[PDB]
């Protein structure tokens, strides 16, 4: 006998975001969760997430990265937990090899943003730890950072609740009632109602979406990332080691500084397993390449950080076909509001894509130009059943 303005099913990375900012207006939000925010089941945990501004995705994101940004800055005043962490991000690559660090370049300049370049012995010179070959270039951006997601949607949370947000947690959304002026869910726990709803389920959309007479293409992939034991006198944050994500002939891979003695983290973003997130196996080492795959890149790159594995952790990332997010309205339901296909590289979005969604639960625009995420572009392959 409780109905609500909005629901938020799936309050993660981009729901919890979205919840916080609806609460911080008034608008009377419940939040529902298959577990219990931050967790390790989702695409959020890992402890650590880059942001980076000068975008090698595509100039087009530069907009919402500052806008993000800022909101993240806004965040760590706002709560006790520790939000971010100015490391700086390094991206590098082959000369003239690498789209990834070429868009790179060219977003920084169109959007003049604050970067340095250098190539070949200045990398390895300036940051002790890398080793590149003299072919290599690079684009510094010493403004971006490392944001640590689990504390973000926790934060989020605690202010949207301590606002009036309601959260149900380990409860599983399994179906949707739409209808042109209301919105009900079905859960094992109850079924809810509102005016509005928001659909953030990560890679469950993958299997949930249907349920919304929506077929479009998302496949979620197993990414793991490994922390090692590294030579704290170089890869230490205190000595200013970067946040990176850089491409060589076999991919792309990110890293992180270690934090406190925490160790170097690694992940390769190129290659992970096609999986379903019911049935995706969250133990790391089960496959060889995991681990192996991972010290390819360290003993040829960043040779004092190969050392003994100090933890292990698997999450997922849910791709589009050009790889590129789904924020949009339902195209045949004006009250419901999806995201998904954040692709491996949406947490640092997520403060920015909160705030959108809340502008298109409410008011079915946003001030935000999310032209490139509609939900009706073609390389997306979207259609109904
Ligand atoms: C996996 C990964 C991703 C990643 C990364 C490293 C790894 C190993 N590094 C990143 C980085 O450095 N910078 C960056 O910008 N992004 C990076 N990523 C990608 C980013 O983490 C993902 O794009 C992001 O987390 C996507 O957010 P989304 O909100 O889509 O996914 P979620 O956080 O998993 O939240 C989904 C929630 O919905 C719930 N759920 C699922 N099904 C249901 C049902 N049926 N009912 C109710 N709730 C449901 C989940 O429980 C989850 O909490
Ligand atoms: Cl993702």
């Known amino acids: 006998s409780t109905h609500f303005d909005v629901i938020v099913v799936g309050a993660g990375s981009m729901g919890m975001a979205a919840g916080y900012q609806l609460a911080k207006q008034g608008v009377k939000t419940l939040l529902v969760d298959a577990f219990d925010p931050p967790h390790t089941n989702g695409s959020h945990h890992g402890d650590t997430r880059i942001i980076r501004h000068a975008y090698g995705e595509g100039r087009e994101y530069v907009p919402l990265a500052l806008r993000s940004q800022e909101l993240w800055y806004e965040l760590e005043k706002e ?3 520790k939000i971010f962490t100015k490391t700086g991000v390094l991206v590098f690559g082959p000369k003239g090899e690498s789209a990834f660090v070429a868009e790179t370049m060219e977003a920084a300049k169109e959007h003049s943003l604050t970067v340095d370049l250098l190539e070949g012995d200045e990398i390895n010179k300036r940051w002790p730890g890398i080793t ?3 072919n290599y270039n690079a684009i510094f951006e010493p403004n971006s950072g490392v944001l640590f997601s689990e504390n973000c949607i926790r934060a989020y949370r ?3 609740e301590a606002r009036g947000a309601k959260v149900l947690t380990h409860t599983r959304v399994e179906d949707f009632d739409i209808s042109p002026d209301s919105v009900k869910i079905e859960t094992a726990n109850g079924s809810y109602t509102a005016d509005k709803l928001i659909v953030s389920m990560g890679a469950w959309n993958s299997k949930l979406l249907s349920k919304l007479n929506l077929d479009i293409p998302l496949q979620p992939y197993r990414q793991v990332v490994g922390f090692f034991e590294s030579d704290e006198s170089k890869y230490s944050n205190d000595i200013d080691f970067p946040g990176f994500m850089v491409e060589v002939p076999n991919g792309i891979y990110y890293g992180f500084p270690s934090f406190g003695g925490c ?4 992940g390769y973003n190129t290659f992970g397993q096609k999986i379903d997130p019911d049935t995706i196996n969250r133990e790391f080492g089960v496959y060889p390449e995991d681990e192996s795959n991972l010290r390819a890149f360290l003993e040829e790159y960043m040779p004092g950080a190969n050392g003994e594995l100090k933890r292990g952790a698997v999450c997922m990332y849910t791709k589009t076909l050009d790889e590129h997010f789904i924020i949009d309205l339902h195209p045949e339901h004006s ?3 999806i995201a998904a296909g954040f692709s491996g590289h949406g947490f640092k979005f997520s403060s920015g894509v909160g705030e959108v969604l809340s502008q298109l639960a409410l008011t079915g625009k946003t001030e935000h130009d999310i032209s490139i995420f509609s939900i009706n ?9």
């Open 263 to 266: 160790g170097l983290k690694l």
């Open 158 to 160: 605690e202010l949207a």
């Open 132 to 134: 590149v070959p003299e």
């Open 377 to 385: 572009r073609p390389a997306l392959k979207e259609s109904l059943q």
């Open 335 to 337: 009250n419901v509001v």
């Open 79 to 81: 709560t006790h937990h």
